[PDB]
Amino acid sequence: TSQVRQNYHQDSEAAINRQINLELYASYVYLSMSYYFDRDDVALKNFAKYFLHQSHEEREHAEKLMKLQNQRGGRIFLQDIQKPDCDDWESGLNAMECALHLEKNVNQSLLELHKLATDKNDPHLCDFIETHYLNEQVKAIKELGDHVTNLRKMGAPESGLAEYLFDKHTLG
Amino acid sequence: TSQVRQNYHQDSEAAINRQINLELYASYVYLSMSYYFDRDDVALKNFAKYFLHQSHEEREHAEKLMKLQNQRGGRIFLQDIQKPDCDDWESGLNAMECALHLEKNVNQSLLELHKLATDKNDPHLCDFIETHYLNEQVKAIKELGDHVTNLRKMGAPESGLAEYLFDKHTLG
Amino acid sequence: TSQVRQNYHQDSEAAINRQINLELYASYVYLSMSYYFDRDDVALKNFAKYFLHQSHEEREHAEKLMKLQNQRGGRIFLQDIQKPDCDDWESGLNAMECALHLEKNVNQSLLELHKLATDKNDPHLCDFIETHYLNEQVKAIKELGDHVTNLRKMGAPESGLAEYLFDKHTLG
Amino acid sequence: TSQVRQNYHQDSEAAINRQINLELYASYVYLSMSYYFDRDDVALKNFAKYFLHQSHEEREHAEKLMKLQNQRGGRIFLQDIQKPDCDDWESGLNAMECALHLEKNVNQSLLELHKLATDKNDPHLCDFIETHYLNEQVKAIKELGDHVTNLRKMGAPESGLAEYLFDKHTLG
Amino acid sequence: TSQVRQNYHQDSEAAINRQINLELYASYVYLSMSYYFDRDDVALKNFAKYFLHQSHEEREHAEKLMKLQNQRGGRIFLQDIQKPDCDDWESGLNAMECALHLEKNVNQSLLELHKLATDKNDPHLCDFIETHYLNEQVKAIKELGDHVTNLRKMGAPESGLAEYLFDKHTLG
Amino acid sequence: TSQVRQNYHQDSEAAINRQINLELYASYVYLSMSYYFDRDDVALKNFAKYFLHQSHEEREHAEKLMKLQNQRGGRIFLQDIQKPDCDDWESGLNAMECALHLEKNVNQSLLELHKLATDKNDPHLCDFIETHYLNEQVKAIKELGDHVTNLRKMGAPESGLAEYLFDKHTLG
Ligand SMILES: [Ca+2]
Ligand SMILES: [Ca+2]
Ligand SMILES: [Ca+2]
Ligand SMILES: [Ca+2]
Ligand SMILES: [Ca+2]
Ligand SMILES: [Ca+2]
Ligand SMILES: [Ca+2]
Ligand SMILES: [Ca+2]
């Protein structure tokens, strides 16, 4: 038991280890989406840059949780990072819809983590999650919803002109 | 026989002279495409600038090979430069498709040159081709493929609006 | 089959997909080592920074291969990223020894890839590997060997003073 | 028939197409002369630079005529570019004498073009030729005559010292 | 056996040790030529500076090979450095002719080293030689050929004025 | 006999030629020591840099003597440069002890040269040696003695920590 550990429940420690794997998995999903748009038969450079940036940010979120685990006297335990479910993402609109779904799932996991921290009376963990994760998730979800709405209204994905213009004017 | 000539096969010397003519020919093809887009009844200024730049680069590639011939103690032998097969290039998409085909043909010739240099055990010639030509060709081919994909997805060449927007947003 | 694909063997395409997973795995190993040194009961900040930097570079190497796959007309196929074999890395010296072993293994895979590219007569792939990977590997291996030699000569890992001073004077 | 065409005779259009080929041919001749001086057994670097610059300028002259053709509503028609008559240019003095002869021939063609434009009452074409070509030709011819006179007076080409010094002091 | 050694053949290691001695020997030859031109009865300062610079570069080439030996896990083994064959170099032209011969000999040794690396399947060693040595040798040889041609055409070495002017205008 | 030679004895000329070889030999010894510290199984970078700098300075000393020989109307006569007696230098302390011994030997040769110049009544040669060599030697010897004393007092070479710290704090 760590000399620094104080008011840090075993259940919280385990849940943090799970969240770490989830963020690394999200990073992997975004990495796959990015390079799909880099294909010569897809070729939407700004969609590709958008998802690569998202991939790097998810990786950063995971490292922040690893830092928190050590700060509290807990111990990091890593697991395999599962490959994404899809290899081909279909279209710009489909990719954005999948990302929205992914983000809502990560948000659900964070809300469950917050409830657990509350039940265990760990105010430091509650504030950490509120401060660094909760608001970021809400902003991310609103942004993806906006994008999905615009692509649909423009006539994507049936209209190839729609996806080309969105890549230039919104993501560019 | 040149006082500088060393490990430079007669077959390699001849193949270099052939590659020189091929690059000059590619330069001529791009020059023709450029001014086709400058016509009052076509009028796509950025397509015109794009192909003119390609024309100048091909000319530079040829001069580099002429420099290499002299460096190795070989002798330059020039041939007529054949006129392009087409005078009218039809459309932006058609021109891009023809350029893709042209580049793949020049790439094939370079791969054959590399194989010959390998058989003759000329490591300097192999590295020269690898360094200055092989990677440039691969990048060029990927770029043209990307362009072709976008124009097709936008609805070219049937859609005149598609070619107008690509000229502004991608080539501009 | 991609409109850009030329002289790119199916076996090469598959080997590239395998190398991509291997680099991502190496990235994961370095990430685990980094945060082990961040523990309150280990506490060697410069060892931690050193391995985190290595982790980011391996991730970059993987992305470069993903870029190459698309450039040649090949198709990315991702696999699970296996968790590292160890959770606890023992000591600074032990971690450096494990990294040396890891790098020699990645080097072996690259040498095998180069031999395959040679057999398939793919000069572009051979040069890509030579240029971006082979020399980097040799430098990395020499650096790790140097570090291991110094730690051993200083009296690590039995001497805790040795690891503390190396962290400050060499890695700092 | 172009919507922009006005007072542009069919004979003028054809003569412009011929002049375009002539300028491209002159460019090719200068390119050949340039690299002859780059040979290890000739080695006069400033003669080489001088002729390469002339080659680029002739190429520019041709592009200007291509621009003019399109401006007037005419249509570009390209022909093969014939290889130069010589592969070996003998000496610095001989090359300068050949260039003088070449320039006087191009000048004759331009004077004939001007006479035709005059007969067809095309004041715009007459002024274009006067402005951009006639004075440039006269200056070029005077310059080459000066060079030829100096080389001869110095004792070229029998004197190898003469050509070496001219390369340094006049062309350098 | 070095902890860093991987895919490095014993024959390659030995050949590298031999190349090291050869470059040091070339350095010694150029050093001797340099100070010959510094004599009061020769007095060509720019010839002297030219050869001294060549001497320093050869020394640098040798150190680079020593660095490579250590990087691969090989062991440096030095030999006596033989004195040059001549003490008196006769003339500027004679010195340049001897240097051309020397460089072609060093080039032959490098080509033989490359063939050996190829037979032993050492892609890293092949690329190292290609990258740092092969192209430098070709440039060096072309430069010396150019110099020899100019001196001969000027009337060296019978003409003392020729060597004086070349020292000022080419080497100065 | 040189038109510039004045009061320059044949014995002095010969002794200068011998000193030149001795300085080149010292340069070779330092070069060998330098790269010994660059080995993966030694790895003391600052010891390596220290000896490489010494190697370059000895080479400079030799060139200065070659310059002096020509200034006085004497003639340079070079000899083979013998390989160092050792290939493996054992340790940092051992290398420093060997260098101290080497420097005292070079100093003895210089003192003998000065005595000869004195006997031949050559005031210019005496002052040259005093000015450029004698004081430099004394400083070099004192510096090496200081280093040897410190390494011994620290517990080298039995203590690997001692050599590591000296490399950082004194030579770094
Ligand atoms: Ca598993
Ligand atoms: Ca013909
Ligand atoms: Ca290469
Ligand atoms: Ca799985
Ligand atoms: Ca024809
Ligand atoms: Ca011996
Ligand atoms: Ca001997
Ligand atoms: Ca004095």
UniProtKB/Swiss-Prot annotation, chains A, B, C, D, E, F:
Fe cation 2 binds at E58, E103, Q137. Coiled coil: none annotated. It is an enzyme of class 1 (oxidoreductase). Keywords: Acetylation, Cytoplasm, Cytoplasmic vesicle, Iron, Iron storage, Lysosome, Metal-binding, Neurodegeneration, Oxidoreductase, Phosphoprotein. Changing R18A: Abrogates interaction with NCOA4. Fails to localize to punctate lysosomal structures. Stores iron in a soluble, non-toxic, readily available form. Important for iron homeostasis. Has ferroxidase activity. Iron is taken up in the ferrous form and deposited as ferric hydroxides after oxidation. Also plays a role in delivery of iron to cells. Mediates iron uptake in capsule cells of the developing kidney. Delivery to lysosomes is mediated by the cargo receptor NCOA4 for autophagic degradation and release of iron. This is Ferritin heavy chain. The lineage of its organism: Eukaryota, Metazoa, Chordata, Craniata, Vertebrata. The gene is FTH1.
